[PDB]
Design a protein around this ligand. Structure first.
Ligand SMILES: C#CCN(Cc1ccc2[nH]c(N)nc(=O)c2c1)c1ccc(C(=O)N[C@@H](CCC(=O)O)C(=O)O)cc1
Ligand SMILES: C#CCN(Cc1ccc2[nH]c(N)nc(=O)c2c1)c1ccc(C(=O)N[C@@H](CCC(=O)O)C(=O)O)cc1
Ligand SMILES: *[C@H]1CC(=O)NC(=O)N1[C@H]1C[C@H](O)[C@@H](COP(=O)(O)O)O1
Ligand SMILES: *[C@H]1CC(=O)NC(=O)N1[C@H]1C[C@H](O)[C@@H](COP(=O)(O)O)O1
Ligand code: NA
Lengths: 264, 264
């Protein structure tokens, strides 16, 4: 996509070398923002073939409140394998915080239900927030939350969302993160009888791994194709009752896939 | 400042009308970003005189972990009066979360101490975060955190910080928020023997109150002046040991202060 290739080029033009946790090394910038008007089309990268089925299953898994990879394996999705323990557990990562953030007095807060009720009852609220950054549980998580903090907004009958992504693997992770949040906006909008607005993506440490540079430049040589179109075939009774088969992506005509290794 | 006035003009030109919590009404946009290179000067708005005494003492109060306004009153700072209870308490707002975030099991994390140790021991980390958005304590806070989530970053010997500000009163709040985080970067850089980098400001619901239009037109008629310079006159033993008298803002030549009532 235009915005995505422009970000790649910005990291290349303005980034600096950094060592990193994984021992791989990155080229890194700090701070970026871009927007996707979801009425233009569904923002799935076209300059390489992306594995959409994994994106959908990962989001459904988050929405169930799950943090063990068994459900992903049942659906032939392997994207979380490298960080799970011997029983498949990642600890209290995204799904757990989204559905059941633990409070100091023994409560748990379902932030997804909270947001939905805020959008329906008080859409001009400035507090329509989900946070995965539960400071008191970070040490139990297999990785710290990358897509950390997000906010909804309504104007002119349209639902928008902004994500603060504190750490972004531009080549491997970002295509998934953009599509995932776009899908969530569509689902949330359907449940609220709203149209879709913008997905606003904001980055913290926004980086290209040192072993993704040939792949990145191959991708930058390619022209984006038309955005595909997302069709939802049913309105479930709640945001938690979607199924994989409720979604179809039309007109997706990507350039060939480009393989790259993930940094563990 | 140029970027601040561009944002103010953008809210006027593009903002849509909201019926907010306070009943006042706003013009609002969603999703914006600005960048202040702190080596270009200290980013204190010059198109009105900003009350440095209040900005500095509020930050020192946060760093103490204090959420009662008595300390502010001892220093003739009244910016939090309208939301405090009869005992001066605001509940577990910024200072409490920064210094004593409660875990579910009865422990505490001092996020500021953690960040200082990350900057000194793991400056490449992508996890150097402070969150005030403690979902499980929102119901006890007098207002929800505006400056909600922030991140530090180190590259080539320079310390940067990005703030996610989920709700921004462009007229009254934003000049304080920019200066406060810029001052924090200078203090942390001093304690870590780093140079200052960028302050990146990211906004969610970014608004002008409907009773601030005259004041907005006045400020937009004024040209910005060169930025001042921050001088730290004493290097304290830790990030927790600063005092108001340690700071001097040199070369600050603002236009006159503008009087505008806060929306409660
Ligand atoms: C974000 C996110 C979700 N996740 C979770 C996740 C977990 C740890 C991470 N660690 C690192 N270093 N980068 C990531 O982006 C990252 C992402 C993903 C993990 C891997 C791939 C990936 O390897 N994609 C390959 C193969 C896809 C496939 O299985 O077919 C690709 O070519 O796209 C994508 C997303
Ligand atoms: C951000 C932040 C901190 N805070 C906390 C705070 C609390 C509630 C809020 N509520 C609303 N509606 N807007 C705010 O920006 C806001 C800010 C501030 C509160 C008031 C002023 C203010 O009235 N400033 C005036 C007068 C300053 C003085 O001389 O006392 C000004 O002219 O600047 C500034 C900051
Ligand atoms: C993390 C998971 C995700 O959804 N998106 C990403 O892009 N993620 C990337 C960011 C880093 O490259 C890595 C996490 O490592 P750190 O915790 O930042 O060291 O995964
Ligand atoms: C809140 C405090 C701060 O530091 N900055 C701000 O700009 N703040 C403004 C934002 C809103 O106008 C108001 C808070 O009200 P909501 O919780 O957003 O309804 O104060
Ligand atoms: Na798969």
């Amino acid at each position: 996509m235009k915005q995505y290739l422009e970000l790649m080029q910005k990291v290349l033009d303005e980034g600096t070398q950094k060592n990193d946790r994984t021992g791989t090394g990155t080229l890194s910038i700090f701070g970026h923002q871009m927007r996707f008007n979801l009425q233009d089309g569904f923002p799935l990268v076209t300059t390489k073939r992306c594995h959409l089925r994994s994106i959908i299953h990962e989001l459904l898994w988050f929405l169930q409140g799950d943090t063990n990879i068994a459900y992903l394996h049942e659906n032939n999705v392997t994207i979380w394998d490298e960080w799970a323990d011997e029983n498949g557990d990642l600890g209290p990562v995204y799904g757990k915080q989204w559905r059941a953030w633990p409070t100091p007095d023994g409560r748990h807060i379902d932030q997804i239900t909270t947001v939905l009720n805020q959008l329906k009852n008080d859409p001009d609220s400035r507090r329509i927030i989900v946070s995965a950054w539960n400071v008191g549980e970070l040490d139990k998580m297999a990785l710290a939350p990358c897509h950390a903090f997000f906010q909804f907004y309504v104007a002119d009958g349209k639902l928008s969302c902004q994500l603060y992504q504190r750490s972004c693997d531009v080549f491997l992770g970002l295509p998934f993160n953009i599509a995932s949040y776009a899908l969530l906006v569509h689902m949330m909008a359907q449940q609220c009888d709203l149209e879709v607005g913008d997905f606003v993506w904001t980055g913290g440490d926004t980086h290209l791994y040192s072993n993704h540079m040939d792949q990145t430049h191959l991708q930058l040589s390619r022209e984006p194709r038309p955005l595909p179109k997302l069709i939802i075939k049913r309105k479930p009774e709640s945001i938690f009752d979607y199924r994989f088969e409720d979604f179809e992506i039309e007109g997706y005509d990507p350039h060939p896939g480009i393989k790259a290794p993930v940094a563990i």
